[PDB]
Design a protein around this nucleic acid. Structure first.
Lengths: 532, 493, 93
DNA sequence: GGTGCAGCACAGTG
DNA sequence: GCACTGTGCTGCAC
């Protein structure tokens, strides 16, 4: 039941092939973004199934044929598990067309495919994504039926266009500098859309609002900004298993709680097995361990005559695993206990340790625990207080110590826990007082120059109509380029075995580079500083 | 490469008051705990201990009133227990019975035997250092001849590149460095580094100062920081706090306990020939289809940029989220030796970004063939304490920033507040439970118990030490602190 | 036959090699004597080969012809071919 | 100073 | 869920 079924709606209308010089065609941009999405799907070996429908197709193929209804629309690939076959289909077998069709018909046929083919299969979520021009002529006379049916089926939707939504900033309006794919800078302005495009935009906007309030607007993206987000996977997320515990103060006070790994450093899930250079097999190559004396004769050692040990300064003490089991320290099961409270300023950011960050709510479906934890959060906020907590995953777990501070959001409030270090982890040093350095005292002109550099090289602009700072470079939304590079290399090798590793695409650099305006502003101050 | 020197004068046996201890006590405990911490870390930089002013002497040159206690050696358990027997007044009473105390001495010959101890070293010498513990500020004020000879010999050690650090201990009437040791101590190369500590009246401050002076500046790496394509400086990366782990097990012989040199071999089975990464290939199978890449290809695709850092820009500190933590923070310091004039520009940038309250966002490639990580350099200003201890070094604290892949969507449901009276009760509870916190207030019980077991085994003691785990909350103590407040909060559920 | 120089070669690895070689159908011997017409060293120097030849003179009838004093390369070639390979200059020391 | 080798806590997944 | 079986990685270390 943990699986999920998704549908991808591709436009091959005549406008898809149409493109502006210096800008990739919408067809090719959507092709690239779906290639990225299906790469993440297949190379993570997920069990989610995918179907692909094409509208604007020169030909037509669908069970919903009849008359001119649902024509120029082809179900290119039905709903089943992915493979490299559809990947190479997107690579070369997918070609733009010149005809147009109503994307509403594509939505109808995709929903019918979900209704029919998923019979006998039990998923967890159902989602459809759409890519189109909004400039194709269509018919809008069954919208309420479509909305009612899809609400009854409870299927999420998502839309991607060669342009972003209405904005007045420098990222949605074509400013100075050429438009770049995947960058943080400008996009198509309110000067390239058509009246048909405005009509389609209003239709999709009213659909999104009628479905999901204000949040439905968020589910509309451009290809460039979708290339730097996980919104395409936003509808196929798998919630992490909650870790329960019983927070305690003293022996009297206890509150059942549930925690999640809010921030975790991810990692690939496939080791690189070494195999034969000829037969390409790992089994016919044997890995063995060498045991010889720490001498010059290099006498072989039988494994039985080997006993473990430990270094203690000068000496080496022998040891055995039974001894390890019998006198190793043992905790008390799992534990989440409050050692006490301390000032928020007393705990500094630099002391945070561990590879994880935990976010803790009260136990699910426990109003008393919820209100207790909320009141504790409020008390911590008013007192500028953070709670030292002794954490233990289970009996086998190492007993960690750490800090937990309140974190209040509009939709929830939680306790954020980060493991703190023991005194052995600390390594202090000394350095020179730069503020009073007798030889590194900068001139006032240097201070003015670096001030100008900082002013020119800002990555966040303070809007003043609402007097709120808008970040111009949100890194927390950028994905990890490592996985994308790995997927690209694997796909290129699979489709072509006798070619070198492909180079990094331009959009990967663009997504990793600051907006061009920052560089333009920093140009002059950088050279001015260089003279110093 | 570290020698400890301690005076045995009668003043070292005179505690200022009752709750205080004699300077001998703090020195002994400091040395013992330093030995323990060194064992925890590594056997590097062997240690020696020697006393002057004893009624006896055991130095090789037989200079009167210089008794050598332990040569420059690895920290041995027998040595640790021999030192620990001095802990407590029983230790001082025993010590005074065969080495004596309170005798005259010439510090010139004491430093002579220290130089002899240094010359006894025949191995990789990193930093020759003398660590003096005395509360007396004018030993040769009675005769200027001894003072002048000691000053000359100290100049000799400084010419021969020998470090000297002195911890003036607590003395009634205070301590003055300029009286005798202004021309004795190894003065630093900068007045900024010429900060003088205060006379220690406790143990923990003495340990902090001693271990600070002991810890050689070990830069993790030297990386180039690119402000732009042309302007490039060099910065040392430092790892202030890192996961301390139990030492790995060592394979040894069953009978003679001689360590087993352990290696590995990779070879074919059809032909039996030994193989290399060149002889092998990297494989990963998806579905039915296997994909084969050369190892060289894998580390080539891993690489994105050359090692170093490419500055992205600046962003106000408020935008950084404290609840967005991924990896332990590092430290960034300038390095003049690699890049000309780097330090001055670095300090100017540090000061200005402190003034403007903005961090520097920058991409970071640790070393060859690693994908880049977006990180933030937040200016960490120098901060001291009443003891002149550098509790906070100046530089750029490096904090890692997570990508959207590293975040986790969480189950979001109804968010409910609580009545203000319950908030006040919780406030009172927290006030009763408040206390000051220090980053070193806790230690790993697991490693402590492990090393207690090792110490018992080495000492052939069937009486394992039991760690008083501080991480265990003082349950009954805080129950007595709270009383009926917890019950009052309990009826509110 | 074929004999293997156990020192600098590992006893377990030598036993595995002897097992796979005897399962290959050709005569392999565990003891140093003169019957074995092929003895493979382990990237040893020529002077060490001469010293081990003298030791074989001790542990064999004097005046007997030496075995094929080759290296691991010829052994791997023969195992890959499933049969003895023609001897080349890069094999003997 | 620097790859790799090992150990191992946790994760998920039954 | 316990024991475990890989990574990357960073302290080692001239």
């Amino acid at each position: 039941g943990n699986k999920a079924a998704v549908v991808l709606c591709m436009d091959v209308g005549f406008t898809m092939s149409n493109s502006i010089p210096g800008i990739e065609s919408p067809f090719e941009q959507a092709k690239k973004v779906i290639t990225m999405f299906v790469q993440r799907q297949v190379f993570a070996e997920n069990k989610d199934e995918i179907a692909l429908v094409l509208f604007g197709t020169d030909g037509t193929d669908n069970p919903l044929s009849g008359g001119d209804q649902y024509q120029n629309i082809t179900v290119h690939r039905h709903l089943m598990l992915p493979d490299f076959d559809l990947l190479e289909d997107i690579e070369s077998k997918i070609q733009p067309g010149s005809q147009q069709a109503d994307f509403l018909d594509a939505l109808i046929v995709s929903m019918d495919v979900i209704q029919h083919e998923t019979i006998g299969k039990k998923f967890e979520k159902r989602h459809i994504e759409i890519f189109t021009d909004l400039s194709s002529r269509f018919s809008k006379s069954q919208l309420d039926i479509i909305i009612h049916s899809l609400k009854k089926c409870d299927i999420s939707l998502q839309f991607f266009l060669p342009f972003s939504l209405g904005k007045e900033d420098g990222s949605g309006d074509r400013g100075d500098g050429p438009f770049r794919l995947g960058g943080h800078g400008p996009s198509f302005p309110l000067k390239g859309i058509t009246e048909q495009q405005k009509e389609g935009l209003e239709i999709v906007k009213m659909v999104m609002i009628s479905l999901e309030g204000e949040d439905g607007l968020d589910e509309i993206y451009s290809f460039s900004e979708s290339l730097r987000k996980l919104c395409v996977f936003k509808k196929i997320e798998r919630h992490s298993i909650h870790w329960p515990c019983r927070l305690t103060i003293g022996s009297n006070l206890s509150i059942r709680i549930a925690a999640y790994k809010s921030i975790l450093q991810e990692r690939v899930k496939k080791t690189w097995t070494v195999v034969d250079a000829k037969t390409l097999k790992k089994e016919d190559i044997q890995k063995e361990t060498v045991y010889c004396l720490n001498d010059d004769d290099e006498t072989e050692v039988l494994k039985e005559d080997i006993i473990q040990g430990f270094r203690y300064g000068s000496d080496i003490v022998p040891f055995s695993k039974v001894d390890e089991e019998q006198m190793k320290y043992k905790s008390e099961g799992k534990c989440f206990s409050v050692l006490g409270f301390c000032k928020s300023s007393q705990v500094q950011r630099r002391f945070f340790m561990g590879n994880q960050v935990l976010k803790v709510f009260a136990a699910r479906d426990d109003e008393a625990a919820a209100v207790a934890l909320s009141s504790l959060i409020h008390a911590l906020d008013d007192l500028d207080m953070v709670a030292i907590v002794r954490y233990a995953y289970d009996k086998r777990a190492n007993p960690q110590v750490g800090v937990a501070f309140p974190h209040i959001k509009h939709n929830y409030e939680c306790l954020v826990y980060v493991q703190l270090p023991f005194m052995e982890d600390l390594r202090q040093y000394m350095f020179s007082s730069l503020k009073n350095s007798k030889k590194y005292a900068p001139t006032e002109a240097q201070l003015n120059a670096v001030d100008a550099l900082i002013d020119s090289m800002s990555l966040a602009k303070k809007d003043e109509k609402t007097d709120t700072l808008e970040d111009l470079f949100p890194t927390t939304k950028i994905p990890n380029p490592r996985f994308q590079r790995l997927f690209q290399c694997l796909l290129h090798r699979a489709l072509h075995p006798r070619e070198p590793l492909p180079p990094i695409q331009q959009h990967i650099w663009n997504m990793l580079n600051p907006p061009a305006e920052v560089t333009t502003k920093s140009q002059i101050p950088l050279s001015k500083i260089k003279t110093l | 490469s570290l020698i400890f020197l301690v005076d045995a004068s009668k003043a070292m046996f005179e505690s200022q008051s009752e709750d205080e201890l004699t300077p001998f006590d703090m020195s002994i405990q400091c040395i013992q705990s330093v030995y323990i911490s060194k064992i925890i870390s590594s056997d590097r930089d062997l240690l020696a201990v020697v006393f002057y002013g004893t009624e006896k002497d055991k130095n090789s040159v037989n200079f009167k009133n210089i008794y050598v206690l332990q040569e420059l050696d690895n920290p041995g358990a027998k040595r640790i227990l021999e030192l620990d027997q001095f802990k407590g007044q029983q230790g001082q009473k025993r010590f005074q019975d065969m080495m004596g105390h309170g005798s005259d001495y010439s510090l010139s010959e004491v430093l002579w035997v220290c130089a002899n101890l240094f010359s006894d070293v025949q191995f990789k010498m990193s930093h020759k250092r003398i660590m003096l513990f005395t509360n007396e500020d004018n030993p040769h004020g009675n005769d200027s001849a001894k003072a002048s000879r000691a000053r000359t010999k100290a100049g000799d050690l400084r010419d021969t590149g020998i470090f000297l650090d002195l911890m003036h201990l607590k003395k009634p009437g205070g301590f003055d460095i300029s009286l005798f040791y202004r021309d004795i101590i190894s003065i630093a190369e900068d007045e900024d580094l010429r900060v003088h500590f205060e006379e220690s009246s406790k143990l923990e401050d003495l340990l902090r100062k001693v271990r600070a002076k002991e810890t050689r500046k070990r830069a993790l790496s030297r990386l180039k920081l690119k402000l732009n394509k042309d302007i490039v400086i060099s910065v040392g990366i430092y790892n202030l706090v890192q996961k301390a782990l139990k030492p790995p097990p060592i394979k040894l012989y069953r009978e003679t306990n001689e360590p087993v040199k352990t290696k590995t071999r990779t070879f074919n089975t059809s032909t039996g020939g030994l193989l290399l990464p060149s002889d092998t290939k990297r494989s990963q199978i998806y579905g039915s289809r296997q994909i084969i890449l050369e190892k060289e290809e894998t580390e080539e695709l891993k690489r994105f940029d050359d090692p170093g850092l490419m500055l992205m820009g600046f962003k106000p500190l408020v935008l950084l989220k404290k609840h967005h933590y991924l990896r332990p923070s590092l430290f960034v310091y300038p390095e003049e030796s690699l890049v000309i004039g780097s330090s001055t520009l670095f300090s100017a940038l540090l000061i200005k970004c402190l003034e403007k309250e903005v961090a520097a966002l920058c991409r970071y490639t640790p070393r060859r063939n690693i994908p880049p990580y977006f990180v933030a350099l937040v200016p960490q200003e120098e901060e001291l304490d009443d003891q002149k201890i550098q509790v906070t070094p100046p530089g750029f604290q490096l904090v890692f920033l997570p990508f959207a892949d590293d975040k986790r969507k969480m189950p979001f449901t109804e968010k409910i507040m609580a009545t203000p009276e319950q908030v006040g009760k919780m406030k009172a509870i927290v006030e009763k439970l408040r206390f000051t916190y220090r980053s070193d207030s806790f230690e790993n019980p697991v490693l402590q118990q492990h090393f207690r077991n090792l110490e018992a085994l080495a000492l052939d003691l069937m009486e394992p030490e039991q760690a008083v785990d501080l991480t265990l909350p003082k349950v009954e103590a805080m129950n007595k602190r709270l009383g009926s407040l917890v019950d009052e909060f309990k009826e509110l559920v | 036959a074929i004999y293997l120089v156990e020192p600098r070669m590992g006893r377990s690895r030598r036993a595995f090699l002897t097992g796979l070689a005897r399962s290959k159908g050709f005569r392999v011997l565990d003891a140093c004597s003169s019957e074995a017409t092929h003895v493979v060293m382990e990237e040893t120097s020529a002077e060490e080969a001469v010293s081990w030849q003298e030791r074989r003179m001790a542990a064999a009838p004097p005046g007997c012809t030496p075995p094929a004093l080759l290296d691991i390369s010829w052994l791997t070639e023969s195992l890959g071919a499933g049969q003895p390979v023609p001897v080349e200059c890069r094999h003997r020391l």
